[PDB]
């Protein structure tokens, strides 16, 4: 009689997985987006008799850090990272997070920032001259040229801080900025250290890694699974309703 | 169901992006025009179940889940680059280099 509960739980988790897939498909064009992997997880109920009821609860692993594809925009301050590079920026709460959205912008007061959040380098957030043109090197050097001044006065005015996370130990926070897991940050320190083995490319921008074939296959599988679970639900309901009349005289 | 109200946001973002592209293509002959480029952002994620214990002498994958919320058009930037110069031979036409605007 309780198989209806297992079937409805499976249906609800299928709906959750469908919602995850729809979320991945919707923002398929945001720059520097990481897809949200998902896979059903089994939980067996048991004890003292005939362990048969095994429930299903959907779960989502961290992400797939497969690099997104690069498109050339020729904008001087667009950065594309290596296989597993990250740019570290302070978040709203004041803590640091990691991202790959290379669409840097400069405010009216010489404040560099990715969308919403300022970029950090040596020390606090990096600041450039008031209206200087900015060029980004292949290793993170920010060269500034004051307008009108002759070209022979290009000066380095700071440096980006680049970290290296392999991917299995980073988890997406509530605002889309990745952070190290508990054990990873315990064993590598609260704040990561800059490394030179990471190189950027100026002028190109990174998209998102969403697989249309994977999305379509998951949608088809979820549809079929949900329909099967619904059929099991109605069969069990009809069986119980027909059998309920035994108590009569 | 959240799927409908997520795909609605996806469709809206796509429609606005198409409108921006159409606007850029419409004024392909407007003098002194700077092209538009629309950038979006994913909404804040909603967590349901926190991840459990990990690396406990086992090779299990994490168990937590968090559903998305959709995508919103966050900004639209105009590329203030340098365009080409067309010769009109009219004595009262001015083409400005570098950066600057007439008040």
């Amino acid at each position: 009689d309780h198989a209806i509960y297992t079937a409805m739980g499976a249906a609800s988790q299928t709906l959750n997985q469908q919602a995850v897939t729809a979320s991945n498909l919707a923002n398929a064009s945001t720059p520097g987006f990481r897809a949200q992997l998902n896979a059903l997880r089994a939980v067996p109920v048991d004890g003292l008799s005939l362990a048969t009821r095994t429930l299903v609860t959907a779960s989502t692993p961290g992400a797939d850090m497969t690099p997104g594809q690069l498109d050339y925009t020729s904008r001087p301050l667009d950065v594309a990272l290596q296989q597993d590079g990250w740019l570290v920026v302070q978040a709203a709460d004041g803590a640091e997070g990691y991202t790959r959205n290379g669409n840097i912008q400069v405010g009216p007061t010489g404040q560099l920032t990715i969308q919403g959040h300022p970029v950090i380098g040596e020390g606090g957030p990096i600041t450039v001259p008031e209206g200087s043109e900015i060029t980004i090197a292949a290793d993170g050097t920010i060269s500034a040229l004051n307008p009108g001044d002759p070209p022979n006065t290009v000066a380095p005015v700071g440096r980006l801080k680049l970290v290296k996370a392999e991917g299995n130990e980073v988890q997406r926070s509530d605002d889309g900025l990745f952070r190290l897991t508990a054990e990873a940050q315990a064993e590598r320190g609260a704040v990561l250290a800059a490394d030179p083995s990471i190189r950027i490319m100026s002028g190109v921008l990174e998209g998102s890694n969403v697989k249309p074939v994977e999305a379509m296959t998951d949608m088809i599988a979820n549809a079929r699974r949900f329909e099967m679970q619904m059929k099991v639900i109605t069969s069990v309901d009809e069986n119980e309703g027909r059998a309920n009349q035994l108590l009569s005289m | 169901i959240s799927s409908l109200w997520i795909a609605k946001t996806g469709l809206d973002a796509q429609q606005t992006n198409m409108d921006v592209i159409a606007n850029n293509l419409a004024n392909v002959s407007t003098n002194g025009f700077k092209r538009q480029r629309a950038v979006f952002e994913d909404l804040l994620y909603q967590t349901i179940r926190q991840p459990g214990a990990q690396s406990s002498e086992q090779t299990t994958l994490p168990s937590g889940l968090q559903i998305g919320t959709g995508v919103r058009p966050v900004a639209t930037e105009r590329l203030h680059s340098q365009g080409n110069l067309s010769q009109t031979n009219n004595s009262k036409d001015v083409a400005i280099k570098g950066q600057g605007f007439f008040q």
Binding site: V43, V45, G47, L48, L55, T57 | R49
Partner: peptide
Amino acid sequence: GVPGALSNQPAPPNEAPIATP
């Protein structure tokens, strides 16, 4: 005891954990 029979001790509670520690 065999299923469906009588017993003098209550069954232990059911837990069904998501992931064992």
